Amino acid sequence: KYTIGLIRVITLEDKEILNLHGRIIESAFPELKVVSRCIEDQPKGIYNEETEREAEPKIIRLAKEFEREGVDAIIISCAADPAVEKVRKLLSIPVIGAGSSVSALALAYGRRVGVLNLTEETPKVIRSILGNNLIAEDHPSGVSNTLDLLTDWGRREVINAAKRLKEKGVEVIALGCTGMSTIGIAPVLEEEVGIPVIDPVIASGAVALHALKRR
Amino acid sequence: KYTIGLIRVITLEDKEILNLHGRIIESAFPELKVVSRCIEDQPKGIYNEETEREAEPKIIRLAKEFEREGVDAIIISCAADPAVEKVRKLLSIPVIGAGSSVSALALAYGRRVGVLNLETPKVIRSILGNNLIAEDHPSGVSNTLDLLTDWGRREVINAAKRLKEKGVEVIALGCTGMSTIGIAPVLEEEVGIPVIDPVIASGAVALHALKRRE
Incomplete structure (x- = not known):
């Protein structure tokens, strides 16, 4: 190891x-x-x-x-x-x-990348790597705390934000917050939108x- | 497995x-x-x-x-x-x-990427975008087999050094034929920067x- x-x-x-x-x-x-x-x-x-x-x-x-x-x-x-x-x-x-890991690996899945943040805008390191391959970015409206994604409404918010990105034709979603890795929201979202959702x-x-x- | x-x-x-x-x-x-x-x-x-x-x-x-x-x-x-x-x-x-694998993974090592070809594939140019600082290839060499010979070897090693002088932080090998002769570690030892094998x-x-x- x-x-x-x-x-x-x-x-x-x-x-x-x-x-x-x-x-x-x-x-x-x-x-x-x-x-x-x-x-x-x-x-x-x-x-x-x-x-x-x-x-x-x-x-x-x-x-x-x-x-x-x-x-x-x-x-x-x-x-x-x-x-x-x-x-x-x-x-x-x-x-x-x-x-750089989440954004770089996202490109290995699709060139049309959408970014899903929590509250903060998209990090500059991710914008840099993605170039004009960052098709769009979205976030869960009403969700201030990561722990809110666990609630019924907060869960719905991020799922919809994923849906909005997929609707904009992105082929892969990179999550721009490590706190999303913590709650394991990614598999739920991928389940919902049917395209790779990358855990940072x-x-x-x-x-x-x-x-x-x-x- | x-x-x-x-x-x-x-x-x-x-x-x-x-x-x-x-x-x-x-x-x-x-x-x-x-x-x-x-x-x-x-x-x-x-x-x-x-x-x-x-x-x-x-x-x-x-x-x-x-x-x-x-x-x-x-x-x-x-x-x-x-x-x-x-x-x-x-x-x-x-x-x-x-x-897409070699170019995307290169971006995880640094933003100033150099591509060492045998021109650059459309896919690699799209993923690297403006992060693609410079590209090169060994002179006189037109086949993987030359990179084995002492001249085709020095040639690819020279091309990688020129990419290194252009200030690239990472080099992406743009030919699947270079993975064959296992040239990557030979270059990285020489130029001192990650050389990503496709x-x-x-x-x-x-x-x-x-x-x-899972």
Whole structure:
């Protein structure tokens, strides 16, 4: 097995919660063992440029500590790919980003890509990779919290947002929020719209596995 | 293990040579068993637009069979993604193109992509888009076999260095024939940046395509 150092850009106390992402990847890809660690003094995580730029140094410090411990690769578990470019320049191992992973892998399924966010607009890393292949973007109206997607109305909201994208002719939907990976909404949506719905956390695992196996 | 139905776009007599791409994928990803089969009357494979047309329905044919016979996913082993789109509208199981795979996976390593060809397939140009910084190919070389010889080797290594000098962060090999001679690691060692092999890239998307639905 391979060991991945996964970074959460939001401070989590519940060990169980902090590890939800690595468990998702390990489940999907057994060859991989994921050690998840979060940044400190940032319980609200990254939701703008300040919190982003504020986390850049913490992310970089953790990523570095993971390499000295022998991790085969890094996965910055955030759709915004916070500090992924910077960290790559610094480490001698692959640096995977949830944002570039979900959008890149979506293209391998269809060139007409639609993006489904929660509340935030579409991350710039995803817009960059998708180019004019980003046909459209949508989100669940009325849903402020990820946990709202679990409710009957919130569930309906995201399903409809998926439907709206499919109706715009997209061939594949990339989810732009790692919190959607956490609730496992993707399979429900794919079920609904009948086209691939890409989970950012699972996608990062696939990319992490390719990086390592391609040697 | 899952079973991948891999389509070779060139008529291959020898069993060893026909199952080249399949073996590569199995070694990189032990979770897949690759059944390789080739199209007929395609001795020279797909090189122009007419030859591509000729092989299209032959691709679509092998695809129908493979599904019918129970393969988990399809892989059209050719960086030009021939019939891929058509094959996706016909079959319901995953259909993976070697070209869309190599270009899409490259984007996950960096945005400034370079393509090392033997010109660039339409599929690769569409997925890379404006992220396609530069492309090249070894001089004097016109066949995979030359890349084995000390000159055809230095040639492809020079082309990759020129792409490296153009500032690319990742290089996508745009020919499925380079996966054969296993040139990728030879270049990456030289130029120092990820060199994405298309055959291995396809195995990776195929495994994601399967694991992600479970």
